[PDB]
Amino acid sequence: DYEKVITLIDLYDNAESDTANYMSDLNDAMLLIKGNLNLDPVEVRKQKEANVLFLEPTVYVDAEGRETEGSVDGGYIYKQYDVQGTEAYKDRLNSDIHMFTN
Amino acid sequence: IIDNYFNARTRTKKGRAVFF
Amino acid sequence: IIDNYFNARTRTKKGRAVFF
Numbered sequence: 127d128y129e130k131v132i133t134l135i136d137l138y139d140n141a142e143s144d145t146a147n148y149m150s151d152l153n154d155a156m157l158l159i160k161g162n163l164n165l166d167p168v169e170v171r172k173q174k175e176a177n178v179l180f181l182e183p184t185v186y187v188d189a190e191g192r193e194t195e196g197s198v199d200g201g202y203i204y205k206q207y208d209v210q211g212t213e214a215y216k217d218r219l220n221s222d223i224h225m226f227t228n
Numbered sequence: 229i230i231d232n233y234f235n236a237r238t239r240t241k242k243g244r245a246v247f248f
Numbered sequence: 249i250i251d252n253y254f255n256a257r258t259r260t261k262k263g264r265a266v267f268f
Contacts, residue, residue: 163245170268176247184243191237198243240258 131223138219145212152205161198 128135157173159165162184181198188194 159245161243161245163243165245165268167268169245169247172247178248180244180246180248182244182246185241187238187240193238196243198245239255 128227131226134219134223134226138216138223141212141216141219145207148207155202155204157200158203159198159200162196163198 159181161181163181179200181200183198184196186194186196
């Protein structure tokens with residue numbers, strides 16, 4: 127009775143284990159800091175109790191005496207995937223398994 | 229030379245990231 | 249030459265990516 131949907135069952139196994147892999151391998155969010163900055167590797171641990179993040183840029187001084195500021199940047203980046211299309215695909219697989227088995 | 233002594237010359241100062 | 253000795257000369261410093 128299920129002999130002919132075993133292909134679809136394998137496909138559902140794969141389409142689920144690869145999302146478990148995506149969930150397990152990548153990092154959900156990170157603070158991203160950019161720029162020529164001194165970051166104390168110990169102060170970064172206080173990141174959870176911090177309220178103000180202050181980034182002071184490097185001031186480069188030219189041989190001709192001109193002063194100019196490096197770029198500094200800060201923000202959170204987060205892991206994301208195509209939920210709409212993977213859910214539509216796994217919904218279709220599940221629906222087809224139930225349809226063909228009645 | 230006298231002016232260079234009185235003014236000196238600034239040098240590249242590296243930035244800081246602080247979480248307070 | 250004396251000033252070049254006292255100041256030296258900086259050279260290209262390659263960046264770093266760190267995950268802490």
